[model samples]
Target chain A: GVNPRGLGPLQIWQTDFTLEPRMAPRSWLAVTVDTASSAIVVTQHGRVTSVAVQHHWATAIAVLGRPKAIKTDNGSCFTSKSTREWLARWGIAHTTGIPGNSQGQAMVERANRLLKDRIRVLAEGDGFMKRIPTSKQGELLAKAMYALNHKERGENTKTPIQKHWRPTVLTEGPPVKIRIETGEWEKGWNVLVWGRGYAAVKNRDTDKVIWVPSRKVKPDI
Target chain B: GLGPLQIWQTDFTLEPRMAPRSWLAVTVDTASSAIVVTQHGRVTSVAVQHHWATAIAVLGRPKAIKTDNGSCFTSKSTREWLARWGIAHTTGIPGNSQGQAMVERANRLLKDRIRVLAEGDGFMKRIPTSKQGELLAKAMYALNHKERGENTKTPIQKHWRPTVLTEGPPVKIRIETGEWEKGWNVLVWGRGYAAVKNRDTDKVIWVPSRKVKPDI
Candidate 1:
């Protein structure tokens, strides 16, 4: 129930792979976009393997900062064992949505459609029917995405980059038994610590603090 | 998201009378103005390459030839075979495919002739895939020997120059080498994924993301 289109900016992201109309890029595009800003964050070209997904996800996180949650369909690349483990390492939640319906994957489809439309006209203008064989495909992709990222219209007065720079984290989060050491449900607070992969929680009873990461306990939601 | 660049399916804007899934393969000469049509039960790379060898024997070698990115033309086997003979394989870029209009035009003209040939046998409504081959052969030679349109030459005369009007200079693609930083060049493309680089003496490692920095 978390990402009710609620996680703005880097808090949640949706990623998908798509084949552009007319084979312009000549390869499948592995694209990641912010759910809130609706900005295209990372676009890579390659096969959809678990390794490739990790590489792309890492790339997205490298620049956009680690998202609190990632949403995608049940495509194998998104649901693979290796990819899930990789997400766990970062304290990032992985979410899968309804198949063939409009809720979870809605924004990405529009993002993809816009890109394909731009790519189609660009190739046609240059005399190609539906494909671009030149190394210029790089420039073409960059150009198409540049327009999307910088496009500000309607309620969107600010570009995605401007909106994306400020990341929002949950200062007051859902109630949790923050299983870290000296941790108890009553007084435990999930103040997420970045990079360390652990949270500092205390028991209100006595001797409140303790070194955590109990193997059986998973901290934060 | 990534389907490797594959060949085009050589789709034809066929008549409704033509049976579904049956295909024709044709190659036109650039300078000689010649044409060859081979109807295939199913057009495969081997089928396309064999036609090339047959046509090469009849038309003799030319500097280059053009085809679309169709799977048959783009096959590693077909392309390698072309390169072996020093024939430069040419095609238009993705955005515009009108460069293929020459063969597209050829496919249309040849189909018209073949359909008319089929009419003589009283099978005008639709010809079976099995019978289409014979009709295709008749059209091939008829165009080959006819002198109405050439520089006074027959099926045997040529200009594929319009492919130029529709295409830009051949684009040089990135030569993908598996060695060196080839693995992550795409994955780590835009940012601080690479800590530093100095030619061969590069240093980088995959670290946590939010702790990341940007590339200058």
Candidate 2:
């Protein structure tokens, strides 16, 4: 059998950043795309730097169900020791493109351009387009991403949405459970998970809350 | 003399609804103490139908309109309807009252009451008021109407800012002298007039003799 090369079956993900229109401070976006499906595996709004890359990557791993290999350009944000250390901790193999070579991680680079064009087209002349408050901009971004993913490609005539299904985790380890700590209301029980308190509705049969780590979670959690 | 015929103005005021904690639009009339329009929706998402019916019903083709300069009033939709109805349109002068007497006074009454109501209900404590227009109409009629001084002698006897009557008579203008320059319309105001324009004329030329010479 040919060696698996440690990649295949949702194994490699790529990272890139796009500077969104200045909706607010930290308007820049860091995005990760699945190498194989071209699916948006993760997205975070704000400045992306060496320190930020580590935090964002941890979140992406948890939400996107972890990957064997991660790829990025040799930009300071990606090649810095902080990013490398985080990759080591997660046991994710890190690969960087040759210095000043654009071909490395070209998938994420092209994804950034497509994202920018789509957002600009949707918001071009609308009054709110100019200063999209960060929250609203993110919401619009999500919708735009959905449309881009779902739109039928004229050449192949099949939408990316038609083909891309999130890979099912064969094993997600044991069930994780937690208890409510504070803020009990008639409607729900507030439980603190990952340093953030979320309500678990009263009388619900579910015994646990699964917190998906994504691109923006505070790392201490 | 036109009596107090219930002239009114209408505009949408923002209000906070309790359920979703979102802003609501309320259309109120200045004169009749009536709520002609009310809708619960996001402010920017409000459609023309929200306020159009209120405008048509409350004032019933007002002789004059008074509203704060908001995007909705200056909007093309509002302007088109005003034009179609032949209603005279007026916006509040920037920073100044521009001598609108009744509406301004009514606004003061409304704002004062709204302040009390807003404070009492603890709305201010809960959330900053996104908008306040619900209390405007209620306050207008609650205040008693009495004519006094210039805005006087009506059956309602409401004292209001006086209107100026018999504007000062027109002034008569006198022209003293006349001079003409070639290739120009000229006016010579008084005695000892001199005219110069073209390299062609040396002496004053008299043309039309009856009125003041046109200033060139």
Candidate 3:
């Protein structure tokens, strides 16, 4: 049997923080890159606080559906109590990537590096007499991160959405509850939006997204 | 002047007579008095959205929707969703009078229909879970088609018409003292008639644009 934790598409996301967009300074820019799809699912500057981290995860889960687990370094943002509890609620497993295993941690490292490089590139056409303006800081990160997601990756070549983010199993939107087992119902979730023969059940409480039989899923609306 | 199906009043009705957790979203057209009712396990913003979607598919979208201060109706997402569809959403004060009697009456009649539909030889038990959807669908169909008036007409035959609204500048409506409810006049039937959206909550309301201050 394939190990549940084994890296697979959409199953795990690699997270890390950087100082640029601001560069060793005021706010920590957080990046969450999907390991399997090589998708930079989120890029947020101004915070790596658990609250900030939690906020993006919710939005990411809404758009990308939930991941089986989130892989991050031992940053306080992911290791903090609030972060742990919030992840627990969504039922997302959190793991500190195998310590010192550079390749294992390389996904987020590459994302973190490119995130900074792309921001600088945008800043030039895109930068200083206070070149990266305050209001444009977050906006700039967004553009670069978006460029990353939209750019082709891997030998076969596909964009993030085209590769892993596209819901072959579940679309996204419309809240739903699914039958966990016969006579057993699991409460709280939006069926990551649509599918007739298959449904992706996103746990409202735990943040786990798993494909289940559409027959077993019932629309909450 | 009011035209047929000018506005729709929608609300959620929890019939104690129905199975637990079953809530029906009820929508009634102000002009035609036509109604649509759909069942959901709970009445949520999304559920109401679904209810209105199904209703809109059949009856056509209205110029505006009048509803009470329900979280489902008043929720930020729900309000914005309505606005996105180009439908004005009017939220009336909870205890205020004469605002939503149209759909409130519809709810009463719907329950009365369900009360009769669910009657067994022994008694009317809570609407059977299996038959709840069917009963509500039938109830809506019967109410829309029923004829008891002197001329004998059904809502289906009484199609909707339109009224033009005058456009104006952005202003605030006199509501709560603390916050100035700011919006633009999207519709104006007369001097006192103005349709505006209540932002933050994202609702569009119809009222006289008699209130003042361009940039509150």
Candidate 4:
């Protein structure tokens, strides 16, 4: 079984809705979380619909690119045929947690809790309560999301934003000679190739030829 | 939210008079209320999985699926199958029958007709359970042709139609900003959640109906 905790950024995006009719005064917040990074996006609206959810998805794609898969509850908004078609067109896998099993979507569930708490704290800090206008509530929610994404968690040293948006670096090593089937070639190894980059080499003992990355080649003295 | 082929709901029910107590699994499209697939067998994960697989094969994958919290539907293999196919599996709350009301209604309609047909036809009465599977299939076909009271159209008609159905009530769009007129262009940022960018500050902010307005 694969450990969900070990999932990487954009591997699985979990989405769910939290009713903040009182907090926002008029809208419900539809929240999506990247299980690997705990990064979140919250959208506030009077009613949750597939279009609203899709808008958020489009926004997420703009920033994070497409996720490998999406996890959502069986809310009608998420289950609609139009939503499915959209996901299909983008080649995103859709996964729904077991019904009534909150733990199945624990990451987003915890995110929702933290989000609500932050919303309350932010609202209180601004001296607004039940009378918080919808726009103001939305602004507060966005701020809360930002804070949540930037805060470091106990499980990981990097903030969710850093984990999600940080770039990875690959350094190349010195080239070396590799043995071939018929002969040996110099400077054929040790240079690291990333992604689709590849290197060609031959067997030292035979005429057989092979193509591999620079990292796969070896130095011959 | 309301679109054909968008969402399908499924549920399992026991045959009232089958000798070995066979089970019937029914899947219905939520938008058009059409019966997608119906199968009868033992109530187990393997059987339920087969039923779902058959449904997807016939109707194609739906964006999401809703089912009740039956062990057969919630098993790990079932979840894995859904994930493998990229189909969403949603189970209703354990005690919340209303959560799966649509499929439950379909189950009742299926069983009711099967029992009636078997009782009315003397030849079919003797081995009702033996012919239960065949009878259930016929019932599903007939049910698909049944006219819905709301639109006076068969489920099949609505399910296959390219145009979206207009039978439901129109959705309300609340516009909070008087300065923002319809057809105005707005820059959407993040999962806007109905948020848009303010021209003056050049920062994205939430707006009622901004994210969903006809014009971007």
Candidate 5:
């Protein structure tokens, strides 16, 4: 209930990096997540550097436009003087998550989980513990991140892209006729009752539903 | 050359219907075909810097950036900025369209779409300039979703993978615990939990949901 940063769609972005130990040389999986929309970007790196971090931020900014603020964990690359100056020059506010608290930075962690899971799946499918080439891993990881962002999670029921760029309207389905007196149910009708005296009745044929008075259901022949 | 961020293309186009001052600066990732940035403004060195800076913020720095030989693009300040970032800037031959083909094509498609959407009657009338940005954003969303002829995958699909969940309205579930009634309002946090405030005590707790019969 307390979002003090006022994180709305595309308002604040969080970023982090994970290590892929299976590769010939350990690779870093850097990610950025827009808290509001849940949009994600994943980049693979041979080594983590301030320059690379800046590059990733630039790429994300290019794709997402400017965010009001960016949140990241305390890491040398993120807290470097150059990175700080760069963000300041662009007028982006920078904040850091509390130390030792991973859950507080939920969005970036979720993105890391997603990226790791997919990478694991690809690795297992190809061979047990067999390392995918660095460049290929980057490509696959990017593709996975793209797919994840486009997905409509059950909680909000909106694709990250849809939430980020488009204006959304509340949707309504077609209304169903109901019985007025007997409280009898009608054929080919499904009811989603919200509370007493109100229900959203759906028509099977057209796949539309509407909220109406529960007493309005009329008997059908 | 083979990497996703190896090459990026940038271009500018004038808004067909809006005032002459209104122009759009676009940057595209050549490898993934993802649009890095689309900014609307007057064509100036400062404007191009803003657009390019915005792109750099998102994607990071590209190995090389391709652009037309426009003064705004070639100004000393712009060159210095690119050099400072360690990005190589390449300009297309003067008057040759093929030099910056990727961005030029993108610009054409973008303007054509904006014109169609803004002009309700085939260019007879147009949407106000003030409202053009919103319309432009919608058009970009659609364009990014379109299947590319070369790969048969939308730019987004190529840039990001397909979603894991079915797209639609949020799914509703019954909350556990006898304390709260079925009709009480709840605020969803993230994932599967919802927070409900206790009216009497004024306390809030996150709760998981379960199947339950409606009292009504």
Candidate 6:
């Protein structure tokens, strides 16, 4: 299957952004599409920054090796100093779509439409008339994005994840891990889960519930 | 002295056939001029009934209820339902105050000015403006229901728990994060206790609170 033909592995990668009409920081979405099989190799959503783009590209590279040509618009982040330097270090070529010529980035454009339609449908169905709240909806969207990449598309009628892999991307740096404390729910112990703490604190004398500051408990894994 | 009057007012508007429309109802507190209950809906009896339930849930039972002589409020079902709660009912008169009740005057100038201001400000084109009716209803509801205090804080904010009650010694009670027994009324503090039971018999059943955040 490594025929290096019109629609084969390691052919093309695409990137774009989706504007979620909510309280979220504007999210940048990047996706790598295999041109030959019309399959998606990797996808990411994050804040608009060189770090985010680098992280997303690094993740894609880890999964699908360095692409022959990384296609992107002339947006500042894509054409930024850091991105160019990173591409050079990885020995990957970069191609810029012509200015005002979105047709050249057809895959990402079509993918953007699909993402918008999916998110819109889900939001409307979930009573998100306006911007969605930055709560469980964010988690649901993350899960949906993952599912989209793994989903079988009608055009290729195959799940992108099921397609053949070329050179697998690798993390260039060491992984960062966090250490947390584990202890009992003492008098002033505060419970935190999923970046949020319980609404109130346990009253020492009466064991009643009272609104308290969130710093009572240390982060526990 | 009877103190400030507490009144629950409710009404329903039909949804537009072509696009989604909301049936809005609100309860206003006369003393603070705050809204106690507000609801929007397309379902039958659900919006008005829910507004009533929520109003009662938040403000306790009102001293009285006032409504335009709409069938929804004036119907046998509503009257019969409310009579059991010992709440007085007054319907607005078709002609004048004596025949109707209090004839609430419209701030036509204020409304007109506000509408003009909104139109000029392109508020009509914005999301908040598009839902102007709902937003206004919500604001009016909050204004009427909120508790009054000498300070800047609204009445409800200042007195969600009464000042007199606050003066009482803080009680130390153990928190139980357990299911409510079959027969109990849920309270604001995420606890359910047997209705009309003694303190000892009342079980503090803990139910998970719903995490509903403000819309962006």
Best by lDDT: 3
In angstroms, the error of model 4 at A8 is 1.5
At residue B157, candidate 1 shows an lDDT of 24
Error of 6 at A70 (Å): 0.4
State how far residue A33 of model 2 sits from its true place (Å). 1.7
lDDT-based ranking: 3, 5, 4, 1, 6, 2
Q: Provide the clash count, candidate 5.
A: 29
Clash number for each model: 24, 7, 17, 14, 29, 20
The candidate, 1 or 5, that scores higher on TM-score is 5
Each candidate's DockQ: 0.01, 0.01, 0.01, 0.01, 0.04, 0.01
Cα-based lDDT for every prediction: 0.52, 0.44, 0.62, 0.59, 0.60, 0.44
Scored against the true structure, residue B106 in model 5 reaches a CA lDDT of: 77
Model 4 whole-model lDDT (C-alpha atoms): 0.59
Weakest 10 consecutive residues of candidate 3 chain B by summed lDDT: B159-168
Name the TM-score of candidate 1: 0.37
Task: Summarize candidate 2's per-residue lDDT along B92-211 as a digit string, tens digits.
Answer: 643345524444444444445555655764765433322222232222223332232353342112212123211111122223543332243222211222121222342233222343
- lDDT score of residue B21 within candidate 1: 39
TM-score of 6: 0.34
Docking class of 4: incorrect
| Top-TM-score structure, candidate number | 5
Model 5: per-residue lDDT, tens digit, B85-197?
68889887743555477777777777776777677434445455445444555456556666657778766655544443211223333544544354332332222333333
- A-chain TM-score, model 6: 0.60
RMSD of 3: 25.1
How does model 6 fare in lDDT?
Answer: 0.44
Q: What tier of docking accuracy does candidate 2 attain?
A: incorrect
Those runs of model 3 whose alpha carbons end farther than 4 Å from true positions after fitting are A1-7, A21-26, A45-47, A98-103, A129-131, A154-156, A166-221, B1-216
Task: Name the lDDT of candidate 2.
Answer: 0.44
Candidate 1 residue lDDT tens string, A3-83: 324334666687888876455444777777787656674344546666666656655553345678888889888788878
